[PDB]
Design a protein around this ligand. Structure first.
Ligand SMILES: CCCCCCCCCCCCCCCCCC(=O)OC[C@H](COP(=O)(O)OCCN)OC(=O)CCCCCCCCCCCCCCCCC
Ligand SMILES: CCCCCCCCCCCCCCCCCC(=O)OC[C@H](COP(=O)(O)OCCN)OC(=O)CCCCCCCCCCCCCCCCC
Ligand SMILES: NC(=O)C1=CN([C@@H]2O[C@H](COP(=O)(O)OP(=O)(O)OC[C@H]3O[C@@H](n4cnc5c(N)ncnc54)[C@H](OP(=O)(O)O)[C@@H]3O)[C@@H](O)[C@H]2O)C=CC1
Ligand SMILES: CCCCCCCCCCCC(=O)OC[C@H](COP(=O)(O)OCC[N+](C)(C)C)OC(=O)CCCCCCCCCCC
Ligand SMILES: CCCCCCCCCCCC(=O)OC[C@H](COP(=O)(O)OCC[N+](C)(C)C)OC(=O)CCCCCCCCCCC
Ligand SMILES: CCCCCCCCCCCC(=O)OC[C@H](COP(=O)(O)OCC[N+](C)(C)C)OC(=O)CCCCCCCCCCC
Ligand SMILES: CCCCCCCCCCCC(=O)OC[C@H](COP(=O)(O)OCC[N+](C)(C)C)OC(=O)CCCCCCCCCCC
Ligand SMILES: CCCCCCCCCCCC(=O)OC[C@H](COP(=O)(O)OCC[N+](C)(C)C)OC(=O)CCCCCCCCCCC
Ligand code: SF4
Ligand code: SF4
Lengths: 137, 235, 359, 155, 440, 72, 111, 115
């Protein structure tokens, strides 16, 4: 299988990257031509954040962290299913039973993280209600 | 194809991660997990189709659908593929990254001129690509809607002249284009009909609903194929 | 600024015009005058137009760059700042820029030349034609602006044309034409403080040995205000500059610490030393390849000339204004290019001067 | 002009000068890409794509995910080029000169009429011959799922 | 303090630290280098750690935001994503209408009310008319009251089309916005056909309405009314039963009945909490006592309940609008009292006393007997009321305007406590914050 | 100073009038009615009335550092 | 235990997105309808005789100005957009010699 | 509902001595945040002058005798602090606060219109 046609494509796309950047740099009118008030550098008002107009100045939930952390074990489970795809016929029943076992052990992990509700954001800080109880004497 | 897409995911989260704007840097932690979470679902669906043909070649998958289109046996995977495809391109209703009402332009609230176009062009190259990929995996790719109409049209040209091969190439890409257009239509169509989905309920959707189903099928399709002695081989 | 730009509410010009001011000097007030700032879309014009329109003096601003003049109007009330399209190769337009005016200011000038104008046509031809037309239009006062080393005998083209430009004004308008020769003016977005902050300064050692005196652009703008509104300044020449002597090599390094920019300044290209015969060659090429005003050959000769003070002319003490030192104003004009924020007072800046020269 | 050398010299230049964690994560991506590209050509196209799918797609974007969580706060040109040049001189990883100067070939044969990809053979052996290695791996993955939750989960 | 800040176990007495080569004090001057000799544990709850008081991440949901449908500066103090404290900074649209009304007669002060709630224009000027007519001891004739009910409900439909559909747009549904805003174009045509302005129709005035209805207006309100029922269904198609819409609203912004009455929440953000109160019933005004219509009361006090109540108030408006089309009487549209209502132009140009009254009404104004009042109506947003103080003169002495949105926005902190940033967007939309009324 | 109270119970409205001078404070009803937090914040901004017992009294309508109380 | 729907019916609607596919279908009905857009400036939206727009001072058919400088409009004008200065004309008529409207101060109210 | 940062309850003091303790305490609070005022507001002057001008405004009211005047000047004293800390004022306002600036002879005022 030849890939010299593919190589020229990758090279052209690499050339297309330089063209997109520089075409802006050669077609925009000179700062003097428009208003001359300054370049992007000195014009710090124009080169700044957007805060809807008013100038101002990540303790993320642990549930978000466990979403990203648990992505890695579940990704290596999916990527290790790749060898079974292109060899499903020649491993027969034996490799099919092994594959199912390879999935059951990982599912017991899915059960564990489903019961603990690890991914739920939860609301421990707020949403409290109480019963007004009179304390007659 | 899956490796190349995951490089683009790395490209998306980098936009905000080099910025101090609060709106732009907001759409990194939520952007990162949304793409991370629905990448498992998109990767597994592609692997189930690859398991039915026992080939990781795009051309072999398309040709394997001659007698049947994988939308008929694997209709649920097509809904799961299309749902996942929306999230990966950050299209609505999975729009929470660049939500105008929530985080303005998202990462693009600090982008202007060329960096805006290049990033905007990327979102629409993915839309065209992921619409073409749904055509390839479930609607037969470049295969004709009718073999008879395909045969009748091509009999009007002589196979010994280059005019025959232009017509076939126009036809074969035409079938793909019509199938792909229907899904580029559905990208827009769902945007005009579904309100945006909340992010916290969005991460729990792919993990607590989609992933168990996708692993359930990946243990289901090998079972049905083995039961009838129909394990696939690359001819 | 303050609250009233005048010392009296009645001001009679050389031409018998009696101008009566109304109001307290704010936006809704008027002074009765009508100036004409040429090159008001330039760096110095914007400050000069702003001060005049701030106190209700009608200002005619001839322009050629349509977009660059839009921001001039915010300074004046309704009907105050007026716009006249013009070109110095057109006479009719200039004869309409000065038609109704009572003060004419000429800030047009260049240190670079272009494919359509040379330095000879701009510093000499334009100023002459303005003064000739401003005289025939019955204007009482003309104020002109030239360089800080106006000397018709200079080998540099900038001071060759700037020096001759002074003569052709008084030879056209007459012996009443005021003249202002400001030092290098520093301000926000100033051409002077720019090249000191520019990172990749090619030929830095060749360019930055030139010595000058800093001067506030606002004080130059306020000085021009006092000159126009005073009739005792007619025919007088002003040499506006600062007290303390600063060299660009000192500034380019004192600035360097405020910017806070080890390996990087050498790797980033902050220092780009160059043999002079190359600089004369590369700046030669960009005159006909670059479409933008680049650091050209004539500017190179100026780097061999320090600032000269023509001691026979006048200063700020004639105007009763204390010149402002770059010590107290350098910091606030580099904050755009700039834990706890590091703030430099007058003492902090002067101490920073000591460190640069200490080996 | 083996340009793969110039990519690493740039990479070796920025590894000596990186200060924050943004550049440190950049060295990771700037190292896998030469690893992937030099595997795509020459040795193994299958493991170039496995690296992209598993390293870039899975473990690299996790680094930038936690860097946004952790924090973002806070030499001389002669010594660097001197070190890089000194690092550049001696690049022979092995000292068997004949093994590095003499070329070899293989002879093909037609005895293998059942031609299938490497990933076919790897699956053939991993799911049959070394099914213990495969099963322990799912056991190591299982411990991580439990291990991540016990370390990080608060309550 | 401001800049920084600093047991479950037995207090254990350890005395006599000694090693094998000597005692602690014999090597205490070197133990600063030996880190296994640190007597200070880093896990003890009494460990002094001088940690700075880093402020919570404070996002500026500033005015330049599609959610801020006016000029709002919402300051959100949150732990992570769940919102701890929110500080709305209103006043960016404060124009001092209340100061300006005191310098203008009652007829000139009327247009200041169309500019409070931009979208409920005619109900704004209905509450100023009711208050002044109450002070004037005058009553609008029968036809005038039906017109103010007819355009009191056209205005209510106009408001909810703006409020419900822009609320959906923030949540994500872009299309239902567009469909409804063509109905707004069709309804604004009735505003312009009777008054001459699409938005700020100074139509309702103290004493009645400006002019009579043009011929054929009733036949256009009807022809629009026959079709409009299907326009609400196509809105309820995309939103009412959508699981994504119900995930964005059910359980979001819950308000108890005790909390609603305490914060003075009125209109729909009080019937969502289950209280069946409505000002068209408590103090019926301007022919609202003649027509028959129902009201809808929530039970969960969340955004989904208020969504349903508004969609019911659509269909109850379309039920009143038809009756006003059928029960419209003939007669004068304004008080037959030329000392408070300008005479017709034809009579002005022919009758001497009409010319005198036309003259004094447009220069001097009409005097209002001294006293004060507090007139409330059921505005589309909620309870809107004015406190007008008269002094026997032709200009109001005081006019306080009680805008429903202003009292709602105060309760935003009490409701948003314990919600995420995408949930704040829903709560603002469910409040209907047009900031002309908030910053009157 | 005028207060308007609503009784959803019996469908009634009552009005409380209480005077005040420029320097004499007035009790804050925020401990009773939470809805008066902003209505008292507005009255001070536009009348300068001292409200004793208000948890957070500040400008709500006028600009920050606005001198003088407009409705006087 | 009191839900009328069976478990399978509730899950078939849930897994197959019953109301969403309907929601798409209603949106697709609009695709085959006549849009509302008019092509301004080649067409104009409806106007009525009561419409308020630009101001104009009128005349009698004989040509004399209609305004007798009575200053009524100046006194009604809520925004004080009108400035009238008047005197007896050269021939004795009660006419105005100065009449301005600050069109940036008028609220287009029709008083 | 909860109050915002650096907020205080509004209580009408009835003792003169009690107020001065609050007045003196508040003064250091202004002084403590002076460097942050410069940093947050990007002021062009060192923090020394910021501490300088704070003190002057306290003295301006030092000699009030009647008590009811004392409270209101203290009630508004806290409010200006609270707005300054929380970055509620914009940079334009704070600059103009510290950017503020001998009378002319009778002839001079007469010459230019006087007042
Ligand atoms: C298609 C091209 C994509 C790359 C475009 C950028 C090219 C610039 C050169 C950087 C890449 C070289 C590879 C070595 C990594 C070096 C990263 C580094 O040290 O910082 C570079 C960048 C600019 O900062 P700089 O001034 O150079 O260094 C001092 C800044 N305090 O500091 C920054 O972090 C700014 C943002 C740069 C983010 C780049 C992310 C890492 C690169 C990944 C994409 C390319 C993958 C590597 C391919 C080449 C490998 C040799
Ligand atoms: C592309 C991939 C393939 C896609 C197609 C996949 C098809 C497979 C779908 C899996 C489920 C198919 C079987 C569905 C019928 C079994 C479930 C059922 O019967 O209902 C649950 C049942 C409770 O009965 P219930 O419906 O709640 O009665 C209420 C009466 N008012 O619960 C019970 O009591 C017994 C449950 C049955 C036990 C075995 C399971
Ligand atoms: N630090 C400084 O800036 C110093 C400058 N000077 C001199 O002061 C004078 C004013 O320059 P400055 O305002 O500071 O900065 P600029 O150089 O930007 O001002 C040049 C002005 O002259 C106009 N000009 C140049 N050529 C033409 C032309 N053919 N036709 C019409 N107008 C033309 C320009 O109009 P346009 O903007 O539309 O191009 C511009 O308004 C200059 O002569 C300068 O040499 C002296 C000492 C210090
Ligand atoms: C592909 C896009 C097609 C349509 C856009 C083309 C407009 C760009 C032309 C242009 O830039 O022409 C103007 C230029 C120079 O003049 P300037 O205004 O300073 O140029 C601005 C851009 N610079 C300063 C970066 C060069 O002239 C030439 O160099 C003539 C050859
Ligand atoms: C939705 C489209 C599904 C479709 O077209 O299939 C619906 C069915 C089955 O056809 P199929 O097996 O998918 O057609 C694939 C075979 N070809 C190549 C002949 C097209 O069509 C009918 O018989 C009608
Ligand atoms: C591609 C061709 C690039 C031409 C640019 C050019 O020739 O530009 C350079 C010259 C000089 O004129 P300038 O750029 O205004 O000089 C100002 C800049 N200084 C101060 C550095 C001198 O321009 C011309 O004579 C343009 C004539 C038309 C050329 C064809 C277009
Ligand atoms: C066939 C391939 C195309 C459609 C694929 C998706 C099928 C969705 C319906 C199954 C789920 C379900 O729950 O179905 C059942 C549901 C709900 O029934 P119910 O509310 O109990 O009915 C009430 C009681 N009756 C039964 C007496 C009436 O019906 C539907 O909502 C049907 C929706 C049809 C319109 C959407 C289809 C067109 C979409 C675009 C096609 C190009
Ligand atoms: C066995 C057959 C397998 C079929 C596989 C298909 C499954 C698809 C998902 C069904 C589950 C579901 O819609 O779930 C809804 C989930 C989470 O809902 P929840 O948090 O659990 O609350 C509801 C359930 N309750 C009350 C029981 C707990 O969120 C959503 O609204 C996701 C909506 C995504 C719509 C994206 C647009 C569609 C584009 C494609 C068509 C053009
Ligand atoms: S002054 Fe005004 S109202 Fe009176 S006649 Fe003239 S235009 Fe008409
Ligand atoms: S329409 Fe304009 S000019 Fe006429 S009264 Fe109203 S605001 Fe004044």
């Amino acid at each position: 299988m030849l890939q010299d046609l593919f190589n020229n494509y990758v090279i052209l796309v690499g050339i297309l990257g330089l063209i997109f950047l520089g075409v802006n740099y050669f077609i925009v009118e000179s700062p003097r031509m428009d208003e001359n008030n300054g370049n992007i550098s000195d014009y710090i008002e124009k080169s700044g954040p957007f805060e809807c107009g008013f100038s101002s100045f990540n303790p993320i939930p642990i549930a978000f962290i466990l979403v990203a952390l648990l992505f890695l074990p579940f990704d290596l489970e999916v990527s290790s299913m790749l060898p079974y795809i292109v060899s499903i016929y020649s491993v027969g029943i034996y490799g099919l039973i092994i594959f199912i076992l390879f999935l059951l052990i990982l599912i017991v992990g899915f059960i564990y993280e489903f019961n603990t509700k690890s991914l739920s954001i939860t609301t421990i800080l707020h949403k409290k209600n109480k019963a007004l109880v009179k304390n007659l004497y | 194809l899956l490796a190349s897409g995951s490089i683009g995911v790395f490209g998306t989260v980098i936009v905000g991660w080099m910025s101090n704007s609060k709106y732009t840097v907001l759409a990194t932690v939520r952007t990162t997990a949304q793409l991370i979470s629905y990448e498992l679902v998109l990767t597994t669906v592609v692997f189930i189709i690859a398991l039915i043909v026992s080939s990781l070649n795009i051309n072999v998958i398309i040709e394997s659908q001659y007698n049947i289109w994988y939308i008929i046996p694997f209709f649920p995977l097509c809904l799961i593929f299309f749902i996942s495809a929306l999230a990966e391109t950050a299209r609505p209703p999975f729009d929470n990254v660049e939500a105008e009402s929530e985080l303005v332009s998202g990462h693009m609230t600090e982008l202007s001129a060329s960096p805006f176009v290049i990033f905007f062009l990327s979102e629409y190259c993915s839309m065209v690509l992921m619409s073409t990929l749904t055509a390839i995996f479930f609607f037969g790719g470049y295969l004709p809607f009718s073999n008879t109409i395909h045969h009748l049209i091509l009999n009007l040209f002589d196979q010994h002249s280059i005019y025959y091969f232009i017509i076939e190439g126009i036809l074969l890409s035409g079938y793909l284009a019509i199938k792909a257009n229907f899904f580029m239509f559905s990208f827009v169509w769902i945007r005009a009909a579904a309100p945006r989905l909340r992010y916290d309920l969005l991460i729990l959707f792919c993990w607590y609903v989609l992933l168990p189903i996708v692993f359930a099928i990946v243990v289901f399709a090998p079972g049905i194929l083995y039961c009838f002695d129909a394990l696939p081989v690359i001819i | 600024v303050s609250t009233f730009p005048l010392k009296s509410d009645i001001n009679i010009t050389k031409s018998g015009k009696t101008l009566l001011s109304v109001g307290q000097g704010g936006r809704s007030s008027r002074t009765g005058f009508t100036a004409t700032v040429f090159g008001g879309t330039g760096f110095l014009g914007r400050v000069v137009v702003s001060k005049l329109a701030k106190h209700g003096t009608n200002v005619v601003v001839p322009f050629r760059n349509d977009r660059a003049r839009r921001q001039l109007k915010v300074n004046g009330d309704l009907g105050v700042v007026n716009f006249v399209e013009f070109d110095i190769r057109n006479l009719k337009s200039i004869e309409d820029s000065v038609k109704y005016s009572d003060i004419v200011i000429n800030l047009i000038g260049t240190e670079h030349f272009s494919k359509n104008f040379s330095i000879e046509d701009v510093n000499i031809g334009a100023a002459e034609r303005i003064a000739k037309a401003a005289k025939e239009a019955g204007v009482s006062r003309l104020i002109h602006v030239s360089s800080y080393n106006a000397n018709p005998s200079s080998s540099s083209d900038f001071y060759a044309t700037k020096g001759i430009g002074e003569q052709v004004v008084r030879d056209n308008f007459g012996p009443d034409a005021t003249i202002v020769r400001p030092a290098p003016m520093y301000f926000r977005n100033s051409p002077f403080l720019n090249e000191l902050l520019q990172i990749k300064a090619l030929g830095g050692n060749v360019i930055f040995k030139k010595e000058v005196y800093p001067v506030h652009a606002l004080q130059v703008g306020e000085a021009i205000e006092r000159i126009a509104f005073d009739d005792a300044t007619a025919g007088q020449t002003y040499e506006l500059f600062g007290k303390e002597r600063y060299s660009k090599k000192e500034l380019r390094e004192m600035i360097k610490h405020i910017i806070h920019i080890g390996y990087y300044p050498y790797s980033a290209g902050f220092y780009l030393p160059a043999p002079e015969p190359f600089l004369y060659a590369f700046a030669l090429i960009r005159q006909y390849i670059s479409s933008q005003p680049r650091f050209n050959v004539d500017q190179l000769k100026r780097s061999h000339i320090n600032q000269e003070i023509d001691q026979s002319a006048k200063t700020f003490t004639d105007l009763g204004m204390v010149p402002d030192e770059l010590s107290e104003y350098l910091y606030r004009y580099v904050k755009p290019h700039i834990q706890n924020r590091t703030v430099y007072s007058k003492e902090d800046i002067e101490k920073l001067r000591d460190y640069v020269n200490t080996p | 002009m083996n340009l793969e050398i110039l990519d690493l010299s740039i990479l070796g230049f920025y590894s000596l000068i990186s200060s924050n964690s943004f550049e440190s994560i950049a060295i990771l991506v700037a190292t896998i890409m030469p690893v992937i590209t030099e595997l795509w050509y020459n040795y193994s196209q299958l493991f170039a794509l496995l690296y992209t799918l598993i390293y870039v797609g899975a473990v690299v974007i996790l680094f930038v995910f936690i860097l946004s969580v952790i924090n973002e706060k806070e030499s001389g040109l002669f010594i660097l080029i001197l070190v890089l040049l000194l690092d550049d001189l001696d690049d022979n990883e092995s000292n068997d000169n004949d093994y590095n100067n003499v070329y070899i070939t293989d002879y093909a044969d037609w005895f293998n009429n059942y031609n299938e990809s490497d990933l076919s053979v790897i699956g053939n052996l991993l799911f049959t011959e070394y099914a213990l290695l495969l099963l322990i791996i799912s056991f190591i993955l299982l411990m991580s799922i439990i291990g991540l939750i016990l370390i990080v989960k608060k309550d | 303090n401001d800049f920084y800040d600093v047991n479950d176990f037995f207090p254990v007495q350890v005395d006599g630290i000694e090693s094998s080569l000597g005692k602690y004090e014999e090597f205490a001057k070197d133990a600063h280098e030996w880190e296994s000799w640190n007597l200070q544990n880093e896990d003890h709850p009494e460990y002094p750690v001088k940690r700075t008081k880093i402020r919570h991440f404070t996002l500026n949901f500033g005015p330049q935001h599609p959610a801020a449908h006016g000029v709002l500066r919402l300051i959100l103090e949150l732990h992570g994503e769940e919102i701890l404290r929110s500080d709305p900074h209103v006043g960016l649209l404060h124009r001092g209408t209340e100061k300006l009304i005191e310098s203008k007669t009652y007829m000139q002060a009327l247009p200041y009310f169309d500019r409070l709630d931009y979208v409920s224009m005619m109900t704004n000027e209905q509450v100023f008319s009711l208050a002044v007519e109450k002070l004037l001891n005058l009553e609008v004739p029968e036809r005038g009251q039906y017109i103010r009910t007819l355009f009191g409900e056209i205005t209510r439909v106009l408001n909810h089309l703006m409020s419900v559909l822009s609320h959906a747009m923030d949540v994500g549904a872009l299309t239902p916005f567009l469909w409804g805003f063509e109905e707004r174009e069709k309804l604004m045509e009735f505003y312009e056909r009777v008054s001459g302005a699409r938005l700020h129709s100074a139509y309702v005035r103290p004493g009645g309405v400006s002019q009579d209805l043009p011929a054929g207006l009733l036949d256009d309100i009807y022809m629009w009314a026959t079709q409009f029922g299907d326009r609400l269904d196509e809105t309820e198609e995309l939103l009412t039963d959508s699981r994504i819409w119900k995930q964005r609203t059910i359980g979001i912004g819950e308000v108890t009945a005790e909390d609603a009455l305490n914060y003075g929440l009125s209109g729909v953000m009080l019937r969502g909490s289950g209280v069946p109160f409505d000002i068209r019933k408590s103090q019926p005004y301007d022919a609202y006592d003649k027509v028959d219509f129902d009201i809808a009361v929530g039970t969960k006090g969340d955004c989904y309940d208020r969504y349903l109540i508004r969609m019911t108030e659509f269909r109850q408006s379309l039920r009143i609008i038809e009756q006003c089309c059928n029960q419209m009487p003939p007669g004068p549209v304004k008080v037959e009292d030329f000392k408070v209502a300008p005479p017709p132009r034809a009579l002005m140009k022919e009758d001497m006393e009409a010319l005198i009254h036309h003259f004094l009404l447009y220069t001097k104004g009409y005097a209002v007997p001294a006293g004060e009042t507090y007139t409330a109506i059921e505005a589309p947003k909620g309870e809107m009321a004015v406190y007008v103080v008269s002094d026997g003169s032709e200009r109001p002495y005081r006019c306080k305007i009680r805008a429903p949105g202003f009292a709602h926005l105060g309760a935003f902190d009490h409701i948003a406590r314990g919600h995420f940033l995408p949930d704040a967007v829903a709560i603002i939309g469910t409040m209907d914050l047009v900031f002309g009324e908030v910053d009157r | 100073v005028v207060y308007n109270l609503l009784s959803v119970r019996h469908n009634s409205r009552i009005r409380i009038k209480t005077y005040a001078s420029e320097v004499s404070p007035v009790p804050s009803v925020v401990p009773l009615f939470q809805g008066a937090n902003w209505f008292e914040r507005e009255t001070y901004d536009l009348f300068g009335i001292f409200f004793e017992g208000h948890p957070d009294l500040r400008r709500i309508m006028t600009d920050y550092g606005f001198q003088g109380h407009p409705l006087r | 235990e009191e839900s009328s729907e069976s478990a399978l019916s509730k899950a078939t609607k849930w897994y197959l997105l019953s109301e969403i596919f309907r929601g798409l279908y209603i949106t697709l009905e609009m695709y085959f309808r006549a849009p509302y857009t008019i092509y301004y400036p080649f067409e104009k939206g409806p106007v009525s005789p009561r419409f308020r727009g630009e101001h104009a001072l009128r005349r009698y058919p004989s040509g004399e100005e209609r305004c007798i400088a009575c200053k009524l409009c100046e006194a009604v004008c809520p925004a004080q957009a009108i400035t009238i200065e008047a005197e007896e004309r050269i021939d004795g008529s009660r006419r105005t010699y100065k009449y301005d409207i600050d069109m940036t101060k008028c609220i287009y109210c029709g008083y | 509902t909860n109050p915002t940062a650096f907020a205080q309850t509004t209580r009408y003091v009835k003792d003169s001595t009690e107020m001065r303790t609050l007045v003196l305490n508040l003064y250091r609070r202004y002084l403590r945040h002076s460097r942050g005022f410069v940093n947050n507001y990007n002021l062009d002057i060192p923090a020394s002058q910021v501490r300088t001008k704070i003190r002057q405004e306290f003295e301006r009211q030092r000699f009030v005798k009647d008590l009811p005047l004392k409270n209101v000047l203290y009630m508004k004293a806290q409010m200006e602090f609270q707005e300054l800390v929380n970055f509620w004022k914009q940079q334009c306002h704070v600059m103009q606060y510290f950017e503020s600036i001998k009378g002319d002879s009778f002839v001079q005022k007469f010459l230019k219109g006087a007042q």
